[PDB]
């Protein structure tokens, strides 16, 4: 419940009303995404993770609980991501990239040449469970 | 916040208290001994691995070690080595020309690593500045003179370094 004094990230101001801001942004997003065709995977992905985050925000009143349950950074970074998603939703309505062309071809390659253990390799660790729920919902 | 802390901040600002410590430890080094080397009477330390002026070597019999295999010419990253070779009058495989452009060379030591008979080496000399560019275009006879001049040190260094290579 204690107010945050710093995010520790230069230029990232503290947002003391982060819960209300997040709820408004997520509701705006869930409205504006309906301009995308329902069949498009982008719409389903956005609705999935946006609804999960919105439910977490609605349930939890303390922003520390929101940050903890989400596993996704400070509420300020969650706000940046929500604003960016809204911006992207606007550009995508305007681009109208949807549908599949008639003679659509796409080459997939799953190259399995191994690399040594000692060379630089990114190993972030497992994501929060919602990412995998979103992915499996997209596949199904 | 408090009269004492505000007073202590004001005094420290007015009396330049933190400037005193820099003066003091600058003065401490003033009386300590100096690290300067009295060149050329005194020299810096170097190792048996030091990559200096190339030299061509001979066997103790006087015969040249180089057999014109051209490996050093092939590996040289700077293309600073130029070799010509032919069958010598006694049938030996030997250079007629062995040039190193000291102004192309990057002093990497690859040629010494490539050589299968320890013929070309980078010796320990580093004091060979010249007044002309042409004196830095070493020919075979100059390299052999270098080898004759530095042979004892080169051999000692090779004995030392044979346990690593």
């Amino acid at each position: 419940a204690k107010v945050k004094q710093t995010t520790g990230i230069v230029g990232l101001d503290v947002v003391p009303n982060a819960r209300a801001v997040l709820i408004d942004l997520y509701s705006k997003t869930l409205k504006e995404i309906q301009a995308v065709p329902e069949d498009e995977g982008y719409r389903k992905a956005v609705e999935s993770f946006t609804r999960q985050r919105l439910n977490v925000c609605k349930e939890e009143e303390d922003w520390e609980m929101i940050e903890k349950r989400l596993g996704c950074g400070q509420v300020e970074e969650l706000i940046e991501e929500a604003r960016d998603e809204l911006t992207l939703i606007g550009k995508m309505i305007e681009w109208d990239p949807w549908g599949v062309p008639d003679d659509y071809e796409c080459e997939v390659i799953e190259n399995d040449a191994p690399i040594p253990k000692h060379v630089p390799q990114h190993r972030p660790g497992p994501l929060p469970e919602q990412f995998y729920k979103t992915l499996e919902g997209l596949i199904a | 916040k408090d009269w004492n802390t505000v007073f202590e901040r004001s005094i420290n600002t007015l009396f330049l208290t933190e400037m005193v410590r820099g003066l003091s430890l600058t003065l401490k080094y003033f009386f300590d001994p100096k690290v300067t080397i009295n060149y050329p009477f005194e020299k810096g330390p170097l190792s048996p691995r030091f990559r200096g002026e190339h030299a061509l070597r001979r066997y103790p019999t006087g015969e040249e070690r180089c057999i014109a295999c051209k490996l050093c010419e092939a590996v040289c990253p700077a293309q600073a080595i130029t070799i010509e070779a032919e069958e010598r009058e006694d049938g030996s495989r030997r250079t007629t020309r062995y040039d190193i452009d000291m102004t192309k060379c990057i002093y990497c030591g690859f040629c010494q690593e490539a050589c299968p008979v320890d013929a070309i080496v980078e010796g320990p000399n580093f004091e060979f500045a010249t007044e002309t560019h042409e004196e830095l275009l070493y020919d075979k006879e100059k390299l052999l003179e270098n080898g004759d001049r530095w042979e004892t040190e080169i051999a000692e260094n090779l004995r030392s370094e044979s346990l690593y290579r």
Partner: protein, 385 residues
């Protein structure tokens, strides 16, 4: 607005630094660097070299952090070859990388300090630099361009007695760091020259491709040694210092702390250094011993092949990056199956950092431009290639 054309034709400020500044009085309105004065066609030259002959080009890019670029190129080649490096070689590589980081940070900090008028720290630091150059020379026979780190491991094993001398250096280096700090850290003139100068937000740092200290100064916890570890960095304890203000003072403090953490890493490498081979044992990519080549046909043949044609690298392409002292140093290597790189793109952090000079120096005084250049740690060998 008037235009001041500043080119310092001397290593006081780089040496090939060339800046066109638009000023409103003493206030900088726009800073435009002109580069290419050290563009030497490195990326074109590399395509004409075997993978071994190309290696010395990497010593000459950020020629203050020689072995780090050697390491990055070796790692890229190892990655494309699927080559396994022995553990002792891994430890030697990391040890030398952290020595290099100390060499770089000493030079950067004290050249910046001399630029803003503090003369003594330069001399003090360059004596320690001389000690570290001696370790370079003892292992490679060169003070600077060692060409010591290679695909498969390192060129030669450590000479007897080197680890003891390195330990002796580490026993006293902390006092040297403390002396540099007491000269600079608390001094009111030093703070007035660096506090709130060249402020960078985390968003700006990401937008302009900043890395290393330039990125960590803005509060972004990001270090490739932890994010994408290589060699034995995951077996080592060290902290990642991050800033809170994103200005020149924070970056200075971060560099000091990075030197302290590098000292820590070196001590750990010295204590954990194992015995064994320093070269990968695959006999198609590494030179045989001198005695083996003089005694065994297979060895002689391999030596001949390796020093004439060089090894082949199967057709592929990848990007490999390391945490160089100046930031993320990357190599985009394209192989076509032959013995020469088809394409070698070098990603230098100084290129991104110097591009950021315009937005960093906006609305600052003329005398702050050199401060901002110093905090960026620009070496034009890597900017221009």
């Amino acid at each position: 607005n008037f235009t001041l054309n500043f080119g310092p034709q001397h290593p006081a400020a780089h040496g090939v630094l060339r800046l066109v500044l638009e000023m409103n009085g003493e206030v900088v309105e726009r800073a435009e660097p002109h580069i290419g004065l050290l563009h030497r066609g490195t990326e074109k030259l590399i395509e004409y070299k075997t993978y071994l002959q190309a290696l010395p080009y990497f010593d000459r890019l950020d020629y203050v952090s020689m072995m780090a670029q050697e390491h990055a190129y070796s790692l890229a080649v190892e990655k494309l070859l699927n080559c396994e490096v022995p553990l002792r070689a891994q430890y030697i590589r990391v040890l030398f990388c952290e020595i290099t980081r100390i060499l770089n940070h000493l030079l950067a900090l004290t050249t910046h300090a001399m630029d803003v008028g503090a003369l003594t720290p330069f001399l003090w630091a360059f004596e320690e630099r001389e000690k570290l150059l001696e370790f370079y020379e003892r292992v490679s026979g060169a003070r600077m361009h060692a060409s010591f780190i290679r695909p498969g491991g390192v060129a030669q094993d450590l000479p007897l007695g080197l680890c003891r001398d390195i330990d002796s250096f580490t026993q006293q280096f902390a006092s040297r760091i403390d002396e540099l700090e007491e000269m600079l850290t608390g001094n009111r003139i030093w703070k007035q020259r660096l506090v709130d100068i060249g402020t960078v937000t985390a968003q700006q740092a990401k937008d302009w491709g900043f890395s290393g200290v330039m990125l960590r100064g803005s509060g972004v916890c990001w270090d490739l040694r932890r994010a994408a570890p290589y060699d034995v960095y995951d077996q080592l304890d060290f902290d990642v210092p991050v800033g809170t203000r994103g200005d020149c003072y924070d970056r200075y403090c971060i560099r000091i702390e990075e030197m302290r953490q590098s000292l820590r890493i070196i001590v750990q490498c010295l204590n954990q250094m194992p015995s064994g081979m320093i070269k990968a044992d695959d006999r198609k990519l590494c030179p045989p011993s001198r005695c083996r080549m003089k005694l065994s046909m297979e060895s002689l043949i391999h030596h001949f092949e390796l020093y004439t044609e060089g090894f082949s690298v199967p057709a592929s392409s990848t990007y490999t990056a390391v945490e160089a002292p100046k930031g993320e140093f990357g190599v985009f290597l394209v192989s076509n199956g032959s013995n020469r790189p088809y394409r070698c793109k070098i990603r230098a952090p100084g290129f991104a950092h110097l591009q950021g000079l315009d937005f960093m120096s906006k609305h600052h005084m003329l005398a702050d431009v050199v401060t901002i250049i110093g905090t960026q740690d620009i070496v034009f060998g890597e900017v221009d290639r």
